[PDB]
Amino acid sequence: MRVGERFTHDFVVPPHKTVRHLYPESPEFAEFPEVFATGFMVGLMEWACVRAMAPYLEPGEGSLGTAICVTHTAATPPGLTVTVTAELRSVEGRRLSWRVSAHDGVDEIGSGTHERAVIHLEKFNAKVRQKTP
Amino acid sequence: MRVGERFTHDFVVPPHKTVRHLYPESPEFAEFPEVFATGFMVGLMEWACVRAMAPYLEPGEGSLGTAICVTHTAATPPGLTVTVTAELRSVEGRRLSWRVSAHDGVDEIGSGTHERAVIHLEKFNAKVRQKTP
């Protein structure tokens, strides 16, 4: 996997990726604008990076996001296509850093950086089962 | 609002706040570990800041998150309580800047910054309509 390499991931925003659907638990969001939530944008960016790195994982490995630093500069109603471009910035062993950017066909909607760490899935699942109450 | 005031927001993590629940349309997330997703943590941080702001908004006003820059350094299985601490850093016109941090009762799980912009809901929803298919 090579620094500078780019991957693109397209996603038509459905009605259920708006703010109120990120936290249906949250009365404070029930009447927010019907626009693509930041937490969902972040998840879409992760998804792009995950798709890009999948062919480069050893069997039984996965990854986790360890940082996200982005802007969200324009609003996207359901129906538009969000294209995330993920560009690999560095690979320090287990740690991968990506420049992520997104646009919805009308506006650039946000960009920034996302870091991931390759993990061993079965090791990880064991050590998370223990801080489980 | 007063700069430097901290607001807490407590949330018991249910089973359905994992990354596979963030994007069920994402087969590529199928075998991810059952831990609190970064996108959900981002939404929880916004939610804390929204609660902090809501008594201080005028009628007709809302807010949107315009940037988020946070680490996500520890994993949280369902059942633990994530406490977000949101501290107001500054109010500059319609821009409110926040220092955000989250802990799951055991570990610090992430920290950084978040920015929001006060919006006139009707004027905003009108601009959104203009780019709705």
Side-chain angles (χ1 to χ4, degrees), chain A residues 1 3-91 93 96-119 121-133, chain B residues 1-4 6-128 130-133:
Chain A
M1 223 190 174
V3 166
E5 175 202 295
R6 284 160 41 109
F7 173 74
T8 292
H9 167 71
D10 307 306
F11 180 73
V12 171
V13 180
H16 53 101
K17 298 297 193 197
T18 63
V19 179
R20 50 187 276 262
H21 300 267
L22 192 70
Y23 278 92
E25 296 82 12
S26 185
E28 292 82 2
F29 290 135
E31 312 273 72
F32 261 55
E34 286 277 56
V35 295
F36 194 42
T38 306
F40 286 129
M41 185 176 70
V42 168
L44 187 64
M45 291 171 166
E46 282 199 48
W47 187 10
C49 296
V50 169
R51 290 181 71 189
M53 64 196 268
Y56 302 94
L57 293 178
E58 299 300 322
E61 283 186 329
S63 70
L64 295 172
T66 61
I68 185 69
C69 187
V70 297
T71 56
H72 198 172
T73 56
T76 303
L80 290 187
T81 302
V82 179
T83 292
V84 172
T85 303
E87 182 194 324
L88 188 69
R89 284 259 151 114
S90 63
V91 187
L96 292 87
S97 174
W98 296 83
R99 167 169 170 72
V100 286
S101 52
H103 90 259
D104 66 11
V106 182
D107 300 305
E108 292 291 345
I109 63 163
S111 72
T113 57
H114 179 226
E115 279 71 42
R116 303 196 65 78
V118 173
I119 56 156
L121 287 168
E122 315 71 27
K123 180 138 303 93
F124 185 81
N125 293 334
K127 211 190 204 297
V128 52
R129 292 175 212 274
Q130 80 180 45
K131 79 179 278 195
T132 305
Chain B
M1 303 204 58
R2 68 154 188 112
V3 160
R6 293 147 303 163
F7 304 85
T8 63
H9 181 255
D10 302 318
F11 183 71
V12 179
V13 184
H16 62 274
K17 298 287 181 194
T18 75
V19 76
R20 72 173 203 273
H21 298 276
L22 191 64
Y23 277 87
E25 47 281 272
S26 164
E28 293 86 26
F29 282 143
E31 288 305 303
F32 262 63
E34 286 295 72
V35 293
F36 190 46
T38 306
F40 286 123
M41 180 182 75
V42 166
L44 192 60
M45 289 170 167
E46 294 202 47
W47 183 7
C49 299
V50 171
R51 287 186 49 238
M53 284 175 71
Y56 302 103
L57 296 174
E58 297 295 323
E61 293 181 334
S63 70
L64 292 168
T66 62
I68 188 84
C69 193
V70 294
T71 55
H72 195 186
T73 56
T76 304
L80 285 75
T81 298
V82 175
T83 296
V84 171
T85 303
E87 171 174 327
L88 184 61
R89 292 179 71 197
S90 68
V91 173
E92 294 169 334
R94 302 173 103 37
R95 183 166 160 174
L96 281 77
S97 303
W98 302 87
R99 193 197 180 279
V100 286
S101 184
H103 102 276
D104 68 10
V106 178
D107 305 309
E108 167 89 77
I109 64 162
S111 64
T113 51
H114 179 230
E115 289 74 45
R116 306 196 60 76
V118 180
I119 54 162
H120 190 295
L121 287 174
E122 288 189 17
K123 289 170 174 162
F124 177 80
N125 285 336
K127 310 305 159 69
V128 169
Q130 293 171 43
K131 56 182 288 189
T132 307

